Curated annotation (Swiss-Prot), chain A:
The keyword Transport applies. It comes from Saccharomyces cerevisiae (strain ATCC 204508 / S288c). Interacts with RUD3. Interacts with VPS13 (via C-terminal part); the interaction is direct. This is ADP-ribosylation factor 1. It catalyses: GTP + H2O = GDP + phosphate + H(+). SMART domains: ARF, RAB, SAR. One of its GO terms (cellular component) is organelle membrane contact site. There is a cross-link at residue 110 (Glycyl lysine isopeptide (Lys-Gly) (interchain with G-Cter in ubiquitin)). GTP-binding protein involved in Golgi vesicle trafficking. May modulate vesicle budding and uncoating within the Golgi apparatus. May recruit the lipid transfer protein VPS13 to Golgi membranes. Recruits polyadenylate-binding protein PAB1 to COPI vesicles, and this is required for correct localization of the asymmetrically distributed ASH1 mRNA. The lineage of its organism: Eukaryota, Fungi, Dikarya, Ascomycota, Saccharomycotina. Keywords: ER-Golgi transport, Golgi apparatus, GTP-binding, Hydrolase, Isopeptide bond, Lipoprotein, Myristate, Nucleotide-binding, Protein transport, Transport, Ubl conjugation.
Curated annotation (Swiss-Prot), chain B:
The coatomer is a cytosolic protein complex that binds to dilysine motifs and reversibly associates with Golgi non-clathrin-coated vesicles, which further mediate biosynthetic protein transport from the ER, via the Golgi up to the trans Golgi network. Coatomer complex is required for budding from Golgi membranes, and is essential for the retrograde Golgi-to-ER transport of dilysine-tagged proteins. This is Coatomer subunit beta. Predominantly expressed in the upper one-third of the oxyntic mucosa and in most regions of the pyloric mucosa. Ubiquitously expressed including platelet, liver, heart, spleen, lung and kidney. Brefeldin A induces dissociation from the Golgi of the beta-COP and presumably the other coatomer subunits. Oligomeric complex that consists of at least the alpha, beta, beta', gamma, delta, epsilon and zeta subunits. Interacts with CAPN8. Interacts with SCYL1 and PRKCE. Interacts with COPG1. Interacts with ARF1 (myristoylated); this interaction is required for binding of COPB1 to Golgi membranes. Interacts (via trunk domain) with ARF1 (via switch I region); the interaction is direct. Interacts with KCNK2 (via N-terminus); this interaction increases the channel-mediated whole cell currents and promotes plasma membrane expression of KCNK2. Interacts with STX17. Interacts with TMEM115. It is found in: Cytoplasm; Golgi apparatus membrane; Cytoplasmic vesicle, COPI-coated vesicle membrane; Cell membrane. It comes from the Eukaryota. The chain holds residues 16 to 106 of 953 of the full protein. The lineage of its organism: Eukaryota, Metazoa, Chordata, Craniata, Vertebrata.
Amino acid sequence: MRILMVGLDGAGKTTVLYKLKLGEVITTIPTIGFNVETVQYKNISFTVWDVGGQDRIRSLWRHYYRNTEGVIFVVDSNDRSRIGEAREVMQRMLNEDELRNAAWLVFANKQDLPEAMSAAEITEKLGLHSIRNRPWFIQATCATSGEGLYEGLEWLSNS
Amino acid sequence: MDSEPPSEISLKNDLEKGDVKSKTEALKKVIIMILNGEKLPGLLMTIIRFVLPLQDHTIKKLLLVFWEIVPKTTPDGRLLHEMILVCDAYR
């Protein structure tokens, strides 16, 4: 299974990936580029493309769209200023023809932080209810603990 | 591929295949058809996707090659930006 994981910078995309691959919480640098890794979960081998979220790189995600079976969209639940921006990025991503049938999994992340928005709140802000054309799911996660990560891989594998 | 102007559908297939040699050969086949002067933009997203960050020189060199002879014309996988897919991860 081919997976594209994106989201704004600092959402926790690489932390998520290497928690999944190494069971370890690594010390990230901003990703100017991608990381690509293969992860085994329950007889599925997920090839995850973690593509950096800062602006220059954001402009490049479209090259990773093609062949994508599922999309992990990571959100920093503690950052309320950038939630609209996330909504804007994700909405036009939903309009992409190469992403047309891909399974849509939102991770509301850093759920560990006291003022993190809830997954329900995030669902309203991102406009997730309005997707009728394909599968979507939202999952509260904490990439450092590992909470919600495998519930994500589970949902994804049931595409 | 000496000069074969309709072969762009096969090149897309050959450009990502999970085999590095095939990808290199494909990108090479694109170069030779452009230099003669033949069809090339269909491929762009495929071309750009494997190679981008890597320090692995041969594909990078190949992509680097294709950016001095047609970068401006091709726009499927590049479009128009300041830090295009010609140079963003080529920093």
